[PDB]
Amino acid sequence: SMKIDVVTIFPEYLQPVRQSLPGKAIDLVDVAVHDLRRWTHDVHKSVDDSPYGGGPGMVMKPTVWGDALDEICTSETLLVVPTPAGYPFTQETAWQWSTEDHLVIACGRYEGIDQRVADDAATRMRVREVSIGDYVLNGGEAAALVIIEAVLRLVPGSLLEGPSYTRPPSWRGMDVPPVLLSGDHAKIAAWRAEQSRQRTIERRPDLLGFDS
């Protein structure tokens, strides 16, 4: 079943852990992590350089990424490039990728990878540039972990959730809502619906088609 390759200059940060949702799956999926510097040939193992046209920071070189993806990818590969400028990664995306035979995730710095890498790959395989949110990360590594977790839990083998409770029924003078103790499946369903409504309207009005 599914193969996931992750390419990064911080392979220890990805390093698959038994005691993980992904770790259990590994013990249905195979996850391999590759050090990008493996495909460098200068003594300094240089993966980036200053941007053409100017600007702050560095851009990852196309040469190294090309050699790396040449080796790892096939025409059947779905190449995932986490980036702040990507299409939104959503739950629909997770379901779609959950049926893929082979995901390769290219982790780069925020400033990004030379655009020609994605352009070149697209001539040979499917390429998806995606953002997991509008906060700013220093690199794609944490995004890769999020994507893997969201995808792996869907592999064979709307409205916000309201508040949940468990035992004891009273705790620090705070009681569980009595309807939840009443065993009335209908009243419980109605209460839960109303709680989710209040919470969605308050926290995520966008989900119900309202202004933010």
Add this chain to the structure above:
Amino acid sequence: SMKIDVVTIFPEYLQPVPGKAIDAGLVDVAVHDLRRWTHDVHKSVDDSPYGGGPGMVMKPTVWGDALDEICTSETLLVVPTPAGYPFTQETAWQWSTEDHLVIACGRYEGIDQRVADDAATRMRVREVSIGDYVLNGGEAAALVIIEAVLRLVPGVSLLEGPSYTRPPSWRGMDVPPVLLSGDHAKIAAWRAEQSRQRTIERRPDLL
């Protein structure tokens, strides 16, 4: 000064996030195993949901004890949850100036609501989601939050368009010549148009 305490039943997951000079006292991250605060020999952290339904809910007595020991009145308690307010860059900026963050990592189904409600009577509590996809638990979200916050700690809109570096020609593709023109006003305008087109294509919501 910034102290981050993370509480999780997967402490090894959180160890990875090295990172810089704590020797200057700018940033300390401590990860705590939630099972430290369990009451029974089976080290139980969750229980069946009241009112029925699938999954488990994390126990209030365990989390209550953990937060009692870890938190103070000055703490900003962060609770990652799919039902949370959106975590944004503005949020990250605000939290970057906090003396003490405690991140309570729970499973998707959640922590008994009384835990957060109780904590909010003596400290600031923030329930947040990092996105509208489903994770099994809050650990990955904590990593995302920790990264977005700490890079704004010193010493630790439109989409950006394509970027390029050497060599000028690679596998049949040349860098856009405008970028080599030495006309920096034109370069800015070109980049603005690239940004416009990419935003329209990928994130029309931003407009």
